[PDB]
Amino acid sequence: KKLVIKNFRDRPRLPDNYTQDTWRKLHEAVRAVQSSTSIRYNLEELYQAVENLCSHKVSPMLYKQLRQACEDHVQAQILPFREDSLDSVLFLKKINTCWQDHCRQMIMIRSIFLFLDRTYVLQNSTLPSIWDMGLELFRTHIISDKMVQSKTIDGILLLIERERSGEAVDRSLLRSLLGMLSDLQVYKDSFELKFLEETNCLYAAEGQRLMQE
Amino acid sequence: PDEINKLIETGLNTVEYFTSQQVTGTSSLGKNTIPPGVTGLLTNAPKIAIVPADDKTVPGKPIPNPLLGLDSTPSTQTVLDLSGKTLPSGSYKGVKLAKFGKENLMTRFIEEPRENPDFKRGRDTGGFHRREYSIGWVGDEVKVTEWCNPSCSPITAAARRFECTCHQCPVTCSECERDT
Amino acid sequence: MSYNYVVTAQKPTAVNGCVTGHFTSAEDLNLLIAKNTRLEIYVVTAEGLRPVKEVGMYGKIAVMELFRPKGESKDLLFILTAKYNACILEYKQSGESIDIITRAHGNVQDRIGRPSETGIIGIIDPECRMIGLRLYDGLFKVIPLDRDNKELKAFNIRLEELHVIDVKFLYGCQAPTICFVYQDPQGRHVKTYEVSLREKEFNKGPWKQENVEAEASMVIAVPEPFGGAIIIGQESITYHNGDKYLAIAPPIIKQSTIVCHNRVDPNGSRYLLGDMEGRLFMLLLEKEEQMDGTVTLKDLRVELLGETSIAECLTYLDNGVVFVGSRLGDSQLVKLNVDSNEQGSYVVAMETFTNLGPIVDMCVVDLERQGQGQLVTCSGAFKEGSLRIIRNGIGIHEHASIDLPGIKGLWPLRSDPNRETYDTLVLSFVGQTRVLMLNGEEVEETELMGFVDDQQTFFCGNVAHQQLIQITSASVRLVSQEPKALVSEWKEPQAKNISVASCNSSQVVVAVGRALYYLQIHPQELRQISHTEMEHEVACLDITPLGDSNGLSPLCAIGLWTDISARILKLPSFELLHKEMLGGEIIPRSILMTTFESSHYLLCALGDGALFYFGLNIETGLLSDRKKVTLGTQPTVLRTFRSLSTTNVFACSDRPTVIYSSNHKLVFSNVNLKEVNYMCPLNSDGYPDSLALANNSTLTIGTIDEIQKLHIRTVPLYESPRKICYQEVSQCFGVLSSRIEVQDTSGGTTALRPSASTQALSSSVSSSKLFSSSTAPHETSFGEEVEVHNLLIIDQHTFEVLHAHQFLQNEYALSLVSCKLGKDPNTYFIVGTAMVYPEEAEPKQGRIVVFQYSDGKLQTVAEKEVKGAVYSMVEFNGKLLASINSTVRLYEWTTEKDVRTECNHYNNIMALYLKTKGDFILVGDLMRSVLLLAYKPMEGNFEEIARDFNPNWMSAVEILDDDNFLGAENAFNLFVCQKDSAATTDEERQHLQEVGLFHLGEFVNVFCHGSLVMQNLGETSTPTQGSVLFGTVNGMIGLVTSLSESWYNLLLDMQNRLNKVIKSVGKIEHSFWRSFHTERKTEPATGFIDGDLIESFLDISRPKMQEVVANLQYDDGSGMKREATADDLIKVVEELTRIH
Ligand SMILES: [Zn+2]
Ligand SMILES: [Zn+2]
């Protein structure tokens, strides 16, 4: 049974800025979660800013914005790795911290945009969680489509190959890098074969060498 | 090797039926379809194709008429009342053919295993067991005796159990087991 | 000697047919829909369809056409049941009454005949002189449409063309012309025939055409203007009009088959075609006036419109709005754009309605553990793939509805201290507020002195001392009643804004970042009792007072934001009493203390959509039997509200629920509504003790319905599901799926569209090479369909596709179960498959994979092998009782973690259905009916106990109790076997007799123990015993329960009384409809009382009621033999309608 509001003034709105000035408070909050800065809008307000800003027809343009924000920040994270200061162990701890962080800083974001993830993005098989969406970005540029792959891989084995014979190698650094590879869905594919193909080889040798020896 | 007088419908795998049936009330087996990869040996006067009357040109203990309830032992016996009231028995394929036969004057089928390849099943086309089908239909009752005829034996409207002209053939095949 | 009860818990949703016309009135456009046994009549209006009447037939609507015979003012309805129950109907409504009357009726079944393939055809001549029925082969029965053929007696003519395909009379012809397509060896000919009622035989059609399209499937007869019949084939179309012959082969058809049609113009001009895979076509035959003679059809062509649902029935309405009756997907209302939108799609989704069928499998589960099972069902087929969640819900009577797009919170006021009912409602929207006054039953926007509106309210209500309070982002503000002006206003020392705010009659607590202040409310002032800072930012507060207390809360609930805690602080000091850690990455978002039955609880609720609740004792100020449930995917918001005489919460979210104590135990009742963002009670006088709800589009007030109805939640898959299971530890589901993929020369098969399986998080393929031996099928190379089966692990809460394990090429999944084996403490996902190939008549290869959802992904633990399909398996006493083809194997789970054959049974033509009670196994055969096997402990092997001796084509089967077995076959009937009780012979024990037969009319696909009604089972005497739900191809869900011998006769007797007094919608005898009927026999009915009837008792007039107990008596179970009026049955019926 329909209903209409008598004298719906439709007046408490003349100017207008409490939008692009909120999209501003968000860019900042982000660029300052990324690039390890501290923001000064303290979380909940930023959260409510989304929940209100986050209404159909707009949520969609917001997502694109939050995405491309990172899309930009990660592509930037590449450059350094695209260097040549060769100690396939620095390169590693490098890439690990470069991960350990993107992690906690996509977790920060998610919490701020919780409402956009568990409302719009969640109502869409099409669209990946903010989380999953960062993993997809950290993949495309960094661990992927780069010398970085074959520089991280050829470097992970190296650490092992050298533990399979009398050195140490810092378990953690690998448990992390390999975990990553897993979390990123490139383990059983950008690391597995080689690993095996390199084991079902090394031990092949040990056989003879040690039978006769 | 014939060609026009061989036009009926081929049914699908059992599972396909199982599947197609759960989505529609409709269940298909109530059509004149011959179960895939099976051929009938009856041209008189591989969908269907002519075959030698019989064959003496090699060993051949004949198969006892399925109806005259006799003992071939290394084989399968399938009963099928064409009017319910009595439970069928035997093997699935047995039953299937039993009905496909009776409803068409046809009594013999051969099932070339999915494995390998007119009809030169001999030296070359040998090496492993095959499935045989003999069918008879007195009244509503129907019975089928199916067995294994070594890969290199011929194929004739004659129901016979062969030995092994291509000394290469197997001993006991999946189908063959359980047969007593 | 066996008694059962069978009710429908859900009418059939699949749409067997739909027709348009003027049935209701000469000036009304109608839409008649056949579900199966139901007939739905709607009326076109504007936005949709208006329900006018919905009757249920005593049969399966096999044919349904309408006709307009000169003489009758409006149209008539011809309906032919599947049991050959014919009839014509009229629509009569005299005020508050609406009856569908039988204007004739009979049965056109011949005792001889051969059930044609292509089924029952039912057609009518445009001259409306008679009806035509292609029932059996070579016999075109004809019915005289004389205004006195009330028995409907008809004659039957001969046909020299046995295999016929489609038939349809032709328009504008002096004598009834019957066109059709028939097949023979030399191909498919399409001829005609003239018919005469006097000569009672065929004369000879005006034309013919010997060789026509190899795959002709539809004879589309065109009206007066053009005339002639069109022939739709599989790749080419042909139109004949006696001396006219055209043909076209648009490659657009090549793809799939056309399966339905509907003329859009009252004359062959434009038509509508249904594709067998979704597509929707529009075929036009551009007319052509000669030069002065008349009209001759020019050129015809087919042009694609777009994609619809898998259109079974198809019918155009008005304004280019087509109705699409899907049978394996949701039916729908469509808009036919004349202006191709983006991606050039003329088709555009207008609206859709739920369609549960075909239910292919389902599991009963009670996620909340509240003693109320729900239904997750593998529903639908190809593209229309989906899962459905059937849950019993509460509704809301909707008194009023506004169109407010933006409400961000709402509160109820009280303008003056005098009156005790609200009269106000403040509606917060983004950057602002708005006060609304309820002028009795109206809504006009006022203004209120003390308040602001250029800010966004966070709360507002009646506090102490005749004062109103408004907390907003800027400041909390106190106001006066009678004087009505601002009288006090707190504020954050430095203009900082309030983040979170609590409040109530006497106290107020607000937060500022970590800063947390407390204010007390007094006369014309807001006194600031205290202040403190939390380690992390605050995200929710609640100072609802409890106990016998007098409005003053000693406590302050709260939930913080990085550490993710949820503690109870002591007010005056903010001292800490209880600190509880929970979450992991999602923070509290709503909190609330409360008393339910007399016990206090605290309820936090994450942003996840989760909801923790503790047994908070006010005295010590600590919480203590931490429970948890999940309600939605969006962060909810709790809000208390009082009912009749009891209190309870209300979880606003994507999946609205309603917490409360049913029995010293919490209870949740999804409200039969979509989104419910904010809410508050509304006690206006114009709106008595109501509720006010706001979604994203509209504000609506109304009261609670509280009359369980069933609510349906759907999760698309875009690919067919076959099986499903519930993993109680991984909080996820198991779903064998399957997508169809085409052929692409590249190296092979590519998908057809994304779907559950092709778009998930983790996803592994089977690396197992036990069949890598050969595997060489030479039919792969040119476009083809090929089933790819996956195992989908699905999240209990969000229903997102977690992991997607693919399977070996040409491999089908068909079994599935989650259990524990041997001494192994794990919990696995054991699959059952089979290697399928068209050249084979059956599978010779297949396997029993064993998985484990460790975390994030699966992990193939075991992996046994076997020769042939694994039709079904099931956890049997720790052991694993699966079944391959003719074999029925039992397995063991060693310490080495492997499955090893351990016992067998080969005496079955094909074991398709298993079931497991104790050491008893109930087996169902493809055609060999049921069998009662047994595990002999000591013997270490199988022993047949009994078995039905009637040949039965089982479809599903279940074990009710130790002695009774329920089965259902392709005949569309149900039956129950029982171990003989004449324990005299040890051979009359090998037999179990069919002691119950019933004709359901539905093709059951799954059965299963479990109920949908709140149980409350401690020791509770119930009138019916046992509970089994069952799924059906038609979407129908039903229920089966056992009865007291004593309750059977009454209800059986009662059933009978009703069939005499109740008019039948076709004058069909209920005894007949429900008669066990197969091509073989046709016994009556027994050990089954269909509760559908025994429920229509509450819907007939009170006069008829007594007109039934008329001399009725009753005696065993209870002491009696005397009469009993209505108010006795009503009690029973009523009390009996509680089990579903
Ligand atoms: Zn063999
Ligand atoms: Zn041989």
Coordinates of N, CA and C in Angstrom, one line a residue, chain C residues 609-748:
Chain C
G609 N 29.6 -10.9 9.1 CA 28.2 -11.2 9.1 C 28.1 -12.3 10.1
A610 N 29.1 -12.5 10.9 CA 29.1 -13.5 12.0 C 28.4 -12.9 13.2
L611 N 28.0 -13.7 14.1 CA 27.4 -13.2 15.3 C 27.7 -14.0 16.6
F612 N 28.6 -13.5 17.4 CA 28.9 -14.1 18.7 C 27.9 -13.7 19.7
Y613 N 27.7 -14.6 20.7 CA 26.8 -14.3 21.8 C 27.2 -15.0 23.0
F614 N 27.3 -14.3 24.2 CA 27.7 -14.9 25.4 C 26.6 -14.8 26.5
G615 N 26.8 -15.6 27.5 CA 25.8 -15.5 28.6 C 26.2 -14.5 29.7
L616 N 26.3 -13.3 29.3 CA 26.7 -12.2 30.2 C 25.9 -12.0 31.5
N617 N 26.6 -12.2 32.6 CA 26.0 -12.0 33.9 C 26.3 -10.6 34.3
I618 N 25.3 -9.8 34.6 CA 25.4 -8.4 35.0 C 26.2 -8.3 36.3
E619 N 25.9 -9.1 37.3 CA 26.5 -9.1 38.6 C 28.0 -8.9 38.7
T620 N 28.8 -9.9 38.1 CA 30.2 -9.9 38.2 C 30.7 -9.1 37.0
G621 N 29.9 -9.0 36.0 CA 30.3 -8.3 34.8 C 31.3 -9.1 34.0
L622 N 30.9 -10.3 33.5 CA 31.8 -11.1 32.8 C 30.9 -12.0 31.9
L623 N 31.5 -12.5 30.8 CA 30.7 -13.4 29.8 C 31.2 -14.8 29.6
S624 N 30.4 -15.8 29.1 CA 30.8 -17.2 29.5 C 30.4 -18.6 28.9
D625 N 29.9 -18.7 27.7 CA 29.5 -19.9 27.0 C 29.4 -19.3 25.6
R626 N 30.6 -18.9 25.1 CA 30.8 -18.3 23.8 C 30.3 -19.2 22.7
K627 N 29.2 -18.7 22.1 CA 28.6 -19.4 20.9 C 28.8 -18.5 19.6
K628 N 28.4 -19.1 18.5 CA 28.6 -18.3 17.3 C 27.7 -18.9 16.1
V629 N 27.3 -18.0 15.2 CA 26.5 -18.3 14.1 C 26.9 -17.3 13.0
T630 N 26.3 -17.5 11.8 CA 26.6 -16.5 10.7 C 25.2 -16.2 10.1
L631 N 25.0 -15.0 9.8 CA 23.7 -14.6 9.2 C 23.7 -14.0 7.8
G632 N 24.8 -13.3 7.6 CA 24.9 -12.7 6.2 C 26.3 -12.5 5.7
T633 N 26.4 -11.6 4.7 CA 27.7 -11.4 4.1 C 28.1 -9.9 4.4
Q634 N 27.1 -9.1 4.6 CA 27.2 -7.7 4.9 C 27.2 -7.5 6.4
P635 N 27.9 -6.4 6.9 CA 28.0 -6.2 8.3 C 26.6 -5.9 8.8
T636 N 26.1 -6.6 9.8 CA 24.7 -6.4 10.2 C 24.7 -5.3 11.2
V637 N 23.6 -5.1 11.9 CA 23.4 -4.1 12.9 C 22.3 -4.7 13.8
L638 N 22.6 -4.8 15.1 CA 21.5 -5.3 16.0 C 20.6 -4.2 16.4
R639 N 19.4 -4.5 16.7 CA 18.4 -3.5 17.2 C 17.3 -4.3 18.0
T640 N 17.2 -3.9 19.2 CA 16.2 -4.6 20.1 C 14.8 -4.0 19.7
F641 N 13.8 -4.8 20.0 CA 12.4 -4.5 19.8 C 11.5 -5.5 20.4
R642 N 10.4 -5.0 21.0 CA 9.4 -5.8 21.8 C 8.3 -6.4 21.0
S643 N 7.9 -7.6 21.3 CA 6.8 -8.2 20.6 C 5.5 -8.1 21.5
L644 N 4.6 -9.0 21.2 CA 3.3 -9.0 21.9 C 3.6 -8.7 23.4
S645 N 4.1 -9.7 24.1 CA 4.5 -9.5 25.5 C 5.9 -9.9 25.9
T646 N 6.7 -10.2 24.8 CA 8.1 -10.6 25.0 C 9.0 -9.7 24.1
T647 N 10.3 -9.7 24.5 CA 11.3 -8.9 23.8 C 12.2 -9.8 22.9
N648 N 13.0 -9.1 22.0 CA 13.9 -9.7 21.1 C 14.6 -8.8 20.1
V649 N 15.8 -9.3 19.7 CA 16.7 -8.5 18.8 C 16.3 -8.6 17.3
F650 N 17.0 -7.9 16.4 CA 16.6 -7.9 15.0 C 17.9 -7.6 14.2
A651 N 18.5 -8.6 13.6 CA 19.7 -8.4 12.9 C 19.6 -8.0 11.4
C652 N 19.6 -6.6 11.3 CA 19.5 -6.1 9.9 C 20.7 -6.4 9.0
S653 N 20.4 -7.0 7.9 CA 21.6 -7.3 7.0 C 21.1 -7.7 5.5
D654 N 21.9 -8.5 4.8 CA 21.6 -9.0 3.5 C 20.6 -10.2 3.7
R655 N 20.8 -10.8 4.9 CA 20.0 -12.0 5.3 C 19.3 -11.8 6.6
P656 N 18.3 -10.8 6.7 CA 17.5 -10.4 7.9 C 17.1 -11.6 8.8
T657 N 17.4 -11.5 10.1 CA 17.0 -12.6 11.0 C 16.3 -11.9 12.2
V658 N 16.0 -12.8 13.2 CA 15.3 -12.3 14.3 C 15.6 -13.1 15.6
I659 N 16.7 -12.7 16.3 CA 17.0 -13.5 17.5 C 16.0 -13.4 18.6
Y660 N 16.0 -14.4 19.5 CA 15.1 -14.5 20.6 C 15.2 -15.9 21.3
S661 N 14.8 -16.0 22.6 CA 14.8 -17.3 23.3 C 13.5 -18.0 23.2
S662 N 13.6 -19.2 22.6 CA 12.5 -20.1 22.4 C 12.4 -21.0 23.6
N663 N 13.5 -21.4 24.1 CA 13.5 -22.3 25.3 C 14.9 -22.3 25.9
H664 N 15.3 -21.2 26.6 CA 16.6 -21.1 27.3 C 17.6 -21.3 26.2
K665 N 17.3 -21.1 25.0 CA 18.1 -21.4 23.9 C 17.8 -20.3 22.8
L666 N 18.8 -19.7 22.2 CA 18.6 -18.7 21.1 C 18.0 -19.3 19.9
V667 N 17.3 -18.5 19.1 CA 16.6 -19.0 17.9 C 16.7 -17.9 16.9
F668 N 16.9 -18.3 15.6 CA 17.0 -17.3 14.5 C 16.0 -17.6 13.4
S669 N 15.3 -16.6 12.9 CA 14.2 -16.9 11.9 C 14.2 -16.0 10.7
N670 N 15.2 -16.2 9.8 CA 15.2 -15.4 8.6 C 13.9 -14.8 8.2
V671 N 13.8 -13.5 8.1 CA 12.6 -12.8 7.8 C 12.5 -12.9 6.3
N672 N 11.3 -13.4 5.8 CA 11.0 -13.6 4.4 C 11.1 -12.2 3.6
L673 N 12.3 -11.6 3.7 CA 12.4 -10.3 3.0 C 13.9 -10.2 2.4
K674 N 14.1 -9.4 1.4 CA 15.4 -9.2 0.9 C 16.3 -8.4 1.9
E675 N 16.8 -7.2 1.4 CA 17.6 -6.4 2.3 C 16.8 -5.7 3.4
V676 N 17.3 -5.5 4.5 CA 16.7 -4.8 5.7 C 17.9 -4.0 6.4
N677 N 18.3 -2.8 5.8 CA 19.4 -2.1 6.4 C 19.2 -1.6 7.9
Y678 N 18.3 -0.7 8.1 CA 18.0 -0.2 9.5 C 16.6 -0.5 9.9
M679 N 16.4 -0.4 11.2 CA 15.1 -0.7 11.7 C 14.8 -0.2 13.2
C680 N 13.6 0.0 13.5 CA 13.2 0.5 14.9 C 11.7 0.1 15.1
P681 N 11.3 0.0 16.4 CA 9.9 -0.3 16.6 C 9.1 1.0 16.3
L682 N 7.8 0.9 16.0 CA 7.0 2.0 15.8 C 5.7 1.8 16.4
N683 N 5.4 2.5 17.5 CA 4.1 2.4 18.3 C 3.1 3.5 18.1
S684 N 3.1 4.1 16.9 CA 2.1 5.1 16.6 C 0.7 4.6 16.9
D685 N -0.3 5.5 17.0 CA -1.6 5.0 17.3 C -2.3 4.6 16.0
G686 N -1.8 5.2 14.9 CA -2.3 4.8 13.5 C -1.7 3.5 13.1
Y687 N -0.5 3.3 13.7 CA 0.2 2.0 13.4 C 0.6 1.4 14.8
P688 N -0.4 0.6 15.4 CA -0.4 0.1 16.8 C 0.8 -0.5 17.6
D689 N 1.6 -1.4 17.2 CA 2.7 -2.0 17.9 C 3.3 -2.6 16.6
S690 N 4.0 -1.7 15.8 CA 4.5 -2.1 14.6 C 6.0 -2.0 14.5
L691 N 6.6 -2.1 13.3 CA 8.0 -2.0 13.1 C 8.2 -1.1 11.9
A692 N 9.4 -0.5 11.8 CA 9.7 0.4 10.7 C 11.0 -0.1 10.1
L693 N 11.0 -0.4 8.8 CA 12.2 -0.9 8.2 C 12.5 -0.1 7.0
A694 N 13.8 0.1 6.7 CA 14.3 0.8 5.6 C 15.4 0.0 4.9
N695 N 15.2 -0.2 3.6 CA 16.2 -0.9 2.8 C 16.9 0.2 2.1
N696 N 17.5 0.0 0.9 CA 18.2 1.0 0.2 C 17.3 1.8 -0.7
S697 N 16.2 1.3 -1.0 CA 15.2 2.0 -1.8 C 13.9 2.4 -1.2
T698 N 13.5 1.8 -0.1 CA 12.3 2.3 0.5 C 12.0 2.1 2.0
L699 N 11.3 3.0 2.6 CA 10.9 2.9 4.0 C 9.5 2.2 4.0
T700 N 9.4 1.3 4.9 CA 8.1 0.6 5.0 C 7.8 0.2 6.5
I701 N 6.6 0.4 6.9 CA 6.2 0.1 8.2 C 5.2 -1.1 8.1
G702 N 5.1 -1.9 9.2 CA 4.3 -3.0 9.2 C 4.5 -3.9 10.4
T703 N 3.7 -4.9 10.6 CA 3.9 -5.8 11.7 C 4.5 -7.1 11.2
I704 N 4.9 -8.0 12.2 CA 5.5 -9.3 12.0 C 4.4 -10.3 11.6
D705 N 4.7 -11.1 10.6 CA 3.7 -12.1 10.2 C 3.7 -13.4 11.1
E706 N 4.8 -13.9 11.4 CA 5.0 -15.1 12.2 C 4.0 -16.2 11.9
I707 N 4.2 -16.7 10.7 CA 3.4 -17.9 10.2 C 4.4 -18.4 9.2
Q708 N 5.3 -19.3 9.7 CA 6.3 -19.9 8.8 C 5.7 -20.2 7.4
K709 N 6.5 -19.7 6.5 CA 6.3 -20.0 5.2 C 7.7 -20.3 4.8
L710 N 8.0 -20.7 3.6 CA 9.3 -21.2 3.2 C 10.0 -20.1 2.4
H711 N 11.2 -19.8 2.7 CA 12.0 -18.8 1.9 C 13.0 -19.4 1.1
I712 N 13.3 -18.9 -0.1 CA 14.2 -19.5 -1.0 C 15.4 -18.6 -1.4
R713 N 16.6 -19.0 -1.1 CA 17.8 -18.2 -1.4 C 18.6 -19.0 -2.5
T714 N 19.0 -18.3 -3.6 CA 19.6 -18.9 -4.7 C 21.1 -18.4 -5.1
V715 N 22.0 -19.4 -5.3 CA 23.4 -19.1 -5.7 C 23.8 -19.6 -7.1
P716 N 23.6 -18.8 -8.1 CA 23.9 -19.3 -9.5 C 25.3 -20.0 -9.6
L717 N 25.4 -20.9 -10.6 CA 26.6 -21.7 -10.9 C 27.0 -21.7 -12.3
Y718 N 26.0 -21.4 -13.2 CA 26.2 -21.3 -14.6 C 26.7 -22.6 -15.2
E719 N 26.4 -23.7 -14.5 CA 26.9 -25.0 -14.8 C 26.2 -26.0 -13.9
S720 N 25.7 -27.1 -14.5 CA 25.0 -28.1 -13.8 C 25.7 -28.9 -12.6
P721 N 24.9 -29.0 -11.5 CA 25.4 -29.7 -10.3 C 24.7 -31.1 -10.2
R722 N 25.4 -32.1 -9.7 CA 24.9 -33.5 -9.6 C 24.8 -34.0 -8.2
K723 N 25.7 -33.6 -7.3 CA 25.7 -34.1 -6.0 C 26.2 -33.1 -5.0
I724 N 25.8 -33.3 -3.7 CA 26.3 -32.3 -2.6 C 26.3 -32.9 -1.3
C725 N 27.3 -32.5 -0.4 CA 27.4 -33.0 0.9 C 27.8 -31.9 1.9
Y726 N 27.7 -32.1 3.2 CA 28.1 -31.1 4.1 C 29.2 -31.6 5.0
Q727 N 30.3 -30.8 5.0 CA 31.5 -31.0 5.8 C 31.4 -30.2 7.1
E728 N 31.1 -30.8 8.2 CA 30.9 -30.2 9.5 C 32.1 -29.5 10.1
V729 N 33.3 -29.7 9.5 CA 34.5 -29.2 10.1 C 35.1 -28.1 9.2
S730 N 35.0 -28.2 7.9 CA 35.6 -27.2 7.0 C 34.6 -26.1 6.8
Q731 N 33.4 -26.2 7.4 CA 32.3 -25.2 7.3 C 32.1 -25.0 5.8
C732 N 32.2 -26.0 5.0 CA 32.0 -25.8 3.6 C 31.2 -27.0 3.0
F733 N 30.7 -26.8 1.8 CA 29.9 -27.9 1.1 C 30.7 -28.6 0.0
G734 N 30.2 -29.7 -0.4 CA 30.8 -30.5 -1.4 C 29.8 -30.5 -2.6
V735 N 30.2 -30.1 -3.7 CA 29.3 -30.1 -4.9 C 30.0 -30.6 -6.2
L736 N 29.6 -31.8 -6.6 CA 30.1 -32.3 -7.9 C 29.4 -31.5 -8.9
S737 N 30.1 -30.9 -9.8 CA 29.5 -30.0 -10.8 C 29.8 -30.6 -12.2
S738 N 29.7 -29.8 -13.2 CA 30.0 -30.2 -14.6 C 29.6 -29.2 -15.6
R739 N 30.6 -28.8 -16.4 CA 30.3 -27.8 -17.4 C 30.5 -28.5 -18.8
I740 N 29.8 -27.9 -19.8 CA 29.9 -28.4 -21.1 C 30.8 -27.5 -21.9
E741 N 31.7 -28.0 -22.7 CA 32.7 -27.2 -23.4 C 32.6 -27.7 -24.9
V742 N 32.8 -26.7 -25.8 CA 32.8 -27.0 -27.2 C 34.2 -27.4 -27.8
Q743 N 34.2 -27.6 -29.1 CA 35.4 -28.0 -29.7 C 36.1 -26.9 -30.5
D744 N 37.4 -26.8 -30.3 CA 38.2 -25.8 -31.0 C 39.5 -26.4 -31.5
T745 N 39.6 -26.7 -32.8 CA 40.8 -27.3 -33.4 C 42.1 -27.1 -32.6
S746 N 42.3 -25.8 -32.1 CA 43.6 -25.6 -31.4 C 44.0 -27.0 -31.0
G747 N 44.1 -27.2 -29.7 CA 44.4 -28.5 -29.2 C 43.2 -29.2 -28.7
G748 N 42.1 -28.4 -28.7 CA 40.8 -28.9 -28.2 C 39.7 -28.0 -27.7

